[PDB]
Amino acid sequence: IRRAATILAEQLEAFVDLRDVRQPEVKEEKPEFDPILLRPVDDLELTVRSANC
DNA sequence: AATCTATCACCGCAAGGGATAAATATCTAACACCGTGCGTGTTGACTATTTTACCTCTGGCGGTGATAATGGTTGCATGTACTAAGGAGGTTGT
Numbered sequence: 131i132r133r134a135a136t137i138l139a140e141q142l143e144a145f146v147d148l149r150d151v152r153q154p155e156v157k158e159e160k161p162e163f164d165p166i167l168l169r170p171v172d173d174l175e176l177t178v179r180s181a182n183c
Numbered sequence: 184a185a186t187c188t189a190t191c192a193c194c195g196c197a198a199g200g201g202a203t204a205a206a207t208a209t210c211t212a213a214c215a216c217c218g219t220g221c222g223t224g225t226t227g228a229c230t231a232t233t234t235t236a237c238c239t240c241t242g243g244c245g246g247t248g249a250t251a252a253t254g255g256t257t258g259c260a261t262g263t264a265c266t267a268a269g270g271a272g273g274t275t276g277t
Contacts, residue, residue: 146192146193147193148193178213178214179212179213179214182213
């Protein structure tokens with residue numbers, strides 16, 4: 131039975147021990163000079179399976 | 184807006200669960216080779232791409248028939264409830 135009653139048993143920690151959970155936003159909107167960043171992987175001199183994935 | 188005692192309880196702080204990431208081992212996939220066969224190339228003969236010419240399709244549309252035929256079709260607007268208007272004409276009045 132326990133998993134079949136868990137959305138009623140594990141609904142109790144819900145009211146105490148009161149630390150919680152969440153995710154962010156992290157990027158910027160792109161792009162300008164100097165062209166040190168304005169380059170594809172072509173500029174790196176690296177292998178082919180890397181260049182596929 | 185500071186103070187705290189005295190709530191109902193979170194912290195006070197022991198235990199232990201899952202997790203994930205390391206190492207291993209398996210999987211697959213990316214590739215480089217090879218071989219196939221197709222769409223790599225010019226040339227050449229074919230036959231029917233197009234044009235024009237000719238001989239002779241399809242379909243443009245104009246034209247109108249005569250033994251005689253010589254009183255026709257057409258069905259349901261609507262049945263109710265109102266009442267405002269015009270139409271009638273005789274006459275007893277203006």
